[PDB]
Coordinates of C-alpha atoms and ligand atoms in Angstrom, one line a residue:
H1 CA 12.0 7.8 -9.4
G2 CA 13.5 10.7 -11.4
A3 CA 13.5 14.5 -11.7
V4 CA 13.7 17.2 -14.3
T5 CA 17.4 17.4 -14.9
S6 CA 17.7 20.2 -17.6
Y7 CA 15.6 22.5 -19.7
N8 CA 15.2 24.0 -23.2
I9 CA 13.5 27.4 -23.1
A10 CA 12.9 29.5 -26.2
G11 CA 15.4 27.4 -28.0
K12 CA 18.2 27.7 -25.3
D13 CA 19.7 25.1 -23.1
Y14 CA 19.7 25.5 -19.3
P15 CA 21.3 22.9 -17.1
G16 CA 19.5 21.9 -14.0
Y17 CA 20.6 21.7 -10.4
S18 CA 22.6 18.6 -9.7
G19 CA 20.6 17.1 -6.8
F20 CA 22.9 14.2 -6.1
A21 CA 26.1 16.3 -6.2
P22 CA 25.6 20.0 -6.4
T23 CA 28.3 21.7 -8.4
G24 CA 27.9 25.2 -6.9
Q25 CA 27.3 26.6 -10.4
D26 CA 24.5 29.1 -11.0
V27 CA 21.3 27.6 -12.5
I28 CA 17.6 28.5 -13.2
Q29 CA 16.3 25.5 -11.2
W30 CA 15.5 25.4 -7.5
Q31 CA 17.3 22.8 -5.5
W32 CA 16.1 19.3 -5.2
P33 CA 17.6 16.6 -3.0
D34 CA 17.4 13.4 -5.0
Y35 CA 14.9 11.2 -6.8
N36 CA 12.7 10.2 -3.9
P37 CA 9.0 10.9 -4.1
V38 CA 7.0 13.3 -1.9
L39 CA 4.5 10.9 -0.3
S40 CA 1.9 13.3 1.1
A41 CA -0.3 16.0 -0.6
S42 CA 0.0 18.3 2.4
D43 CA 3.8 18.1 2.6
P44 CA 5.6 21.5 1.9
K45 CA 8.2 19.6 -0.1
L46 CA 5.3 19.2 -2.6
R47 CA 5.9 22.8 -3.9
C48 CA 9.5 22.7 -5.2
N49 CA 10.9 19.6 -3.5
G50 CA 12.2 21.7 -0.7
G51 CA 14.3 24.1 -2.9
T52 CA 14.5 27.8 -1.9
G53 CA 15.7 29.6 -5.0
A54 CA 18.1 30.0 -7.8
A55 CA 20.6 32.6 -9.2
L56 CA 19.5 32.7 -12.8
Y57 CA 16.4 32.9 -15.0
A58 CA 15.6 32.0 -18.6
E59 CA 14.1 34.6 -20.9
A60 CA 10.9 33.8 -22.7
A61 CA 8.0 35.5 -24.4
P62 CA 4.4 34.3 -24.4
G63 CA 4.0 31.5 -27.0
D64 CA 7.5 30.3 -26.5
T65 CA 8.2 26.6 -25.7
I66 CA 9.3 25.3 -22.3
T67 CA 10.8 21.8 -22.6
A68 CA 11.9 19.9 -19.5
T69 CA 14.1 16.8 -19.6
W70 CA 14.1 13.9 -17.2
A71 CA 17.4 12.2 -17.3
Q72 CA 15.7 9.1 -15.7
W73 CA 12.1 8.2 -15.2
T74 CA 10.6 4.8 -14.3
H75 CA 6.8 4.9 -13.9
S76 CA 4.2 4.4 -16.6
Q77 CA 1.0 5.4 -14.7
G78 CA -0.1 8.8 -13.6
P79 CA -0.5 12.4 -14.8
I80 CA 1.9 15.1 -15.8
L81 CA 1.2 18.7 -14.6
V82 CA 3.0 21.9 -15.5
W83 CA 2.3 25.0 -13.6
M84 CA 3.4 28.6 -13.3
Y85 CA 3.3 31.2 -10.7
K86 CA 3.6 35.0 -10.9
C87 CA 6.3 36.2 -8.5
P88 CA 5.1 39.5 -6.9
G89 CA 8.6 41.0 -7.4
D90 CA 12.1 39.8 -7.2
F91 CA 12.7 36.0 -7.7
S92 CA 14.7 36.1 -4.4
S93 CA 11.6 37.1 -2.3
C94 CA 9.3 34.6 -4.1
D95 CA 8.6 31.5 -2.0
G96 CA 5.7 30.3 -4.2
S97 CA 3.2 30.7 -1.4
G98 CA -0.5 31.5 -1.6
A99 CA -2.9 30.7 -4.4
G100 CA -0.8 31.9 -7.3
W101 CA -0.2 28.5 -9.0
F102 CA -2.0 27.9 -12.3
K103 CA -1.7 25.0 -14.8
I104 CA -0.5 25.7 -18.3
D105 CA -0.2 22.0 -19.4
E106 CA -1.5 18.5 -18.3
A107 CA -1.7 15.0 -19.6
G108 CA -3.5 12.0 -18.1
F109 CA -5.1 8.7 -19.1
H110 CA -6.2 7.9 -22.7
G111 CA -6.7 4.2 -22.5
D112 CA -9.8 2.5 -23.8
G113 CA -10.7 0.9 -20.4
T114 CA -11.3 -2.6 -21.6
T115 CA -8.0 -3.7 -23.1
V116 CA -5.9 -0.9 -21.6
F117 CA -6.8 -0.2 -18.0
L118 CA -5.6 2.5 -15.5
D119 CA -3.1 -0.1 -14.1
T120 CA -2.0 -1.5 -17.4
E121 CA 1.8 -1.4 -17.7
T122 CA 2.3 -2.1 -21.5
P123 CA 1.0 -0.6 -23.5
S124 CA 0.3 2.1 -20.9
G125 CA -2.7 4.4 -21.5
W126 CA -0.9 7.3 -19.8
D127 CA 1.1 10.0 -21.6
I128 CA 3.7 9.8 -18.8
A129 CA 4.8 6.4 -20.2
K130 CA 6.6 8.4 -22.9
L131 CA 8.9 10.0 -20.3
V132 CA 10.2 6.5 -19.3
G133 CA 13.6 5.3 -20.1
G134 CA 16.1 8.1 -20.2
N135 CA 16.5 11.7 -21.5
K136 CA 12.9 12.1 -22.4
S137 CA 11.3 15.5 -22.7
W138 CA 8.0 17.3 -22.3
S139 CA 7.2 20.5 -24.1
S140 CA 4.6 23.2 -23.1
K141 CA 3.8 26.5 -24.6
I142 CA 3.8 29.6 -22.4
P143 CA 0.2 30.7 -22.7
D144 CA -0.6 33.5 -25.2
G145 CA -0.9 37.1 -23.7
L146 CA 0.6 36.2 -20.3
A147 CA 1.5 39.4 -18.5
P148 CA 5.2 40.0 -18.3
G149 CA 7.3 39.4 -15.2
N150 CA 9.2 37.0 -13.0
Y151 CA 7.6 33.5 -13.0
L152 CA 8.3 30.1 -11.5
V153 CA 7.4 27.1 -13.6
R154 CA 6.8 23.8 -11.9
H155 CA 6.8 20.3 -13.4
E156 CA 5.1 17.6 -11.5
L157 CA 4.7 13.9 -12.2
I158 CA 2.4 11.9 -10.0
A159 CA 3.1 8.2 -10.2
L160 CA 0.1 6.0 -9.3
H161 CA 1.5 2.4 -9.8
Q162 CA 0.9 1.7 -6.0
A163 CA -2.7 1.4 -5.0
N164 CA -3.6 4.2 -2.5
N165 CA 0.1 5.4 -2.4
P166 CA 0.6 8.4 -4.6
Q167 CA 4.1 9.6 -5.3
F168 CA 4.7 13.2 -6.3
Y169 CA 7.9 14.3 -8.1
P170 CA 8.2 18.1 -8.5
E171 CA 10.8 20.7 -9.4
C172 CA 10.8 24.5 -10.0
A173 CA 12.7 26.8 -12.4
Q174 CA 12.9 30.5 -12.9
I175 CA 11.4 32.2 -16.1
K176 CA 11.5 35.9 -16.9
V177 CA 8.5 36.4 -19.2
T178 CA 9.0 39.3 -21.7
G179 CA 6.6 41.2 -23.9
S180 CA 3.6 43.3 -23.1
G181 CA 0.8 40.8 -22.5
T182 CA -1.9 41.5 -20.0
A183 CA -3.6 38.2 -19.5
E184 CA -3.7 37.0 -15.9
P185 CA -5.6 33.9 -14.8
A186 CA -8.7 34.5 -12.7
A187 CA -8.8 33.2 -9.1
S188 CA -10.7 30.1 -10.3
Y189 CA -7.6 29.0 -12.3
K190 CA -5.2 29.4 -9.4
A191 CA -4.3 27.1 -6.4
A192 CA -2.0 26.9 -3.5
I193 CA 0.7 24.1 -3.4
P194 CA 0.4 22.2 -1.2
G195 CA -3.4 22.7 -1.3
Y196 CA -4.7 22.0 -4.8
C197 CA -5.6 18.4 -3.8
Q198 CA -6.2 16.4 -0.6
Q199 CA -4.6 13.1 0.2
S200 CA -8.0 11.3 0.2
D201 CA -9.3 12.7 -3.1
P202 CA -10.4 9.9 -5.5
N203 CA -8.0 10.9 -8.1
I204 CA -5.1 11.0 -5.5
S205 CA -5.5 7.9 -3.2
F206 CA -7.5 5.1 -4.8
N207 CA -7.4 1.5 -5.9
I208 CA -5.9 1.7 -9.3
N209 CA -5.9 -2.1 -9.7
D210 CA -9.7 -2.1 -9.3
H211 CA -11.1 -2.7 -12.7
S212 CA -14.8 -2.2 -11.6
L213 CA -14.2 1.5 -11.2
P214 CA -14.7 3.9 -14.1
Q215 CA -11.6 3.8 -16.3
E216 CA -11.4 7.6 -16.5
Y217 CA -9.0 9.8 -14.6
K218 CA -9.9 13.3 -13.7
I219 CA -6.6 15.3 -13.6
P220 CA -6.2 17.1 -10.2
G221 CA -6.0 20.9 -9.8
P222 CA -8.0 23.6 -11.6
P223 CA -8.7 23.7 -15.4
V224 CA -5.7 24.7 -17.6
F225 CA -5.1 28.4 -18.3
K226 CA -5.0 29.0 -22.1
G227 CA -4.6 32.8 -22.3
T228 CA -5.9 34.4 -25.5
Ligands
CU1 CU1 9.8 5.8 -8.5

């Protein structure tokens, strides 16, 4: 349970949408309803937690840092994914559809698999554990050379504490990427969302408490796009 509540982009502060009590104030973040998980990989809410858009954008150049903050976050097992999506034109006509989503950042499981397992709570072998406990942040570089334009950026945490019962927590925000890069990820780096994973994939629904499995976690979605 939790959501990205605010951002720091290229050194500037951007408040998020206030899911539990919208203020009516202009923000860069697409709407989100509350802290409940999306429970199915094929649910359209998986994309941007049912948001439709936003009035503002943050400026950023390639190589600039995107930092998202989770005012609250409770789970110590599962991956972090950060994606981007090139809007064809105006942010207002961008719904995030088709296979435009590419990963720019990811973190998964780094435990040794014999004292720290996939299901171990403390000390968790997942980078997500570092987001737990209030006002924790995650920073990602906007890939070098990225062609300029209007982009969405999507943060997604997938909690895996419950055997066979994945829990997705996503949000989208609006980034106007400046400069004169030309790099665009190839089709093999891009996915649809929902679409990049199936509910029954072995890194999505599986028995995390089963210590006889390999203690490695393949992060879902395509390889990360690095740029140049
Ligand atoms: Cu939760």
